[PDB]
RNA sequence: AUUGAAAGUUGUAGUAUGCGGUCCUUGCGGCUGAGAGCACUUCAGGAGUUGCCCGCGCCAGC
């Protein structure tokens, strides 16, 4: 009733329980297989490399010695058509976990 | 709603700043498209042909 996040999300709450599941579940994200078939070789994997050049307080620039910050990393960058698949259970949003209905005038009507 | 319930391996980062593919170099020197050659030789603008035939300078004039 107070928070918005706990109940669509879920919650733990490790001193009385109140286990909430999260009402909205996704799946991994992998390129699909026939991508993969027709590809078979190829590495559509790229890595490129990226610097972060310091200029000291003239011109001047060092590498470890003088204290800067001037390294030169890499990322990896991905390609391919991927796959993708949510599900989401709004119906429950609002309702306790508990008690999907309370039953008190001989109809199950849902408890909000 | 189950080894279960909530759970970014994340936020900032120029693989940069300068650097003539440049300077010298004849596709040049010598070379007759030249020498011999009748557009010549034989040819009538020629033969025949009337500038013809008839014709009052005329009659009256002191």
Same mark, same amino acid.
């Given at each position: 009733?107070?928070?918005?996040?706990?109940?669509?999300?879920?919650?733990? $709450?490790? #001193?009385?329980? @109140?286990?909430? =599941?999260?009402?909205?579940? /996704?799946?991994?994200?992998?390129?699909?297989?026939?991508?993969?078939?027709?590809?078979?070789?190829?590495?559509?994997?790229? $890595?490129? #490399?990226?610097? @972060?050049?310091? =200029?000291?307080?003239?011109? /001047?620039?060092?590498?470890?010695?003088?204290?800067?910050?001037?390294?030169?990393?890499?990322?990896?960058?991905?390609?391919?058509?991927?796959?993708?698949?949510?599900?989401?259970?709004?119906?429950?949003?609002?309702?306790?976990?508990?008690?999907?209905?309370?039953?008190?005038?001989?109809?199950?009507?849902?408890?909000?």
């Amino acid at each position: 009733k107070e928070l918005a996040d706990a109940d669509v999300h879920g919650f733990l $709450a490790p #001193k009385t329980g @109140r286990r909430r =599941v999260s009402l909205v579940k /996704a799946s991994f994200i992998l390129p699909t297989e026939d991508f993969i078939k027709e590809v078979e070789g190829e590495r559509l994997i790229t $890595a490129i #490399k990226h610097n @972060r050049v310091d =200029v000291d307080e003239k011109g /001047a620039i060092g590498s470890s010695k003088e204290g800067t910050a001037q390294m030169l990393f890499s990322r990896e960058y991905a390609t391919g058509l991927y796959g993708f698949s949510i599900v989401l259970d709004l119906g429950l949003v609002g309702i306790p976990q508990g008690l999907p209905v309370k039953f008190e005038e001989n109809q199950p009507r849902p408890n909000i």
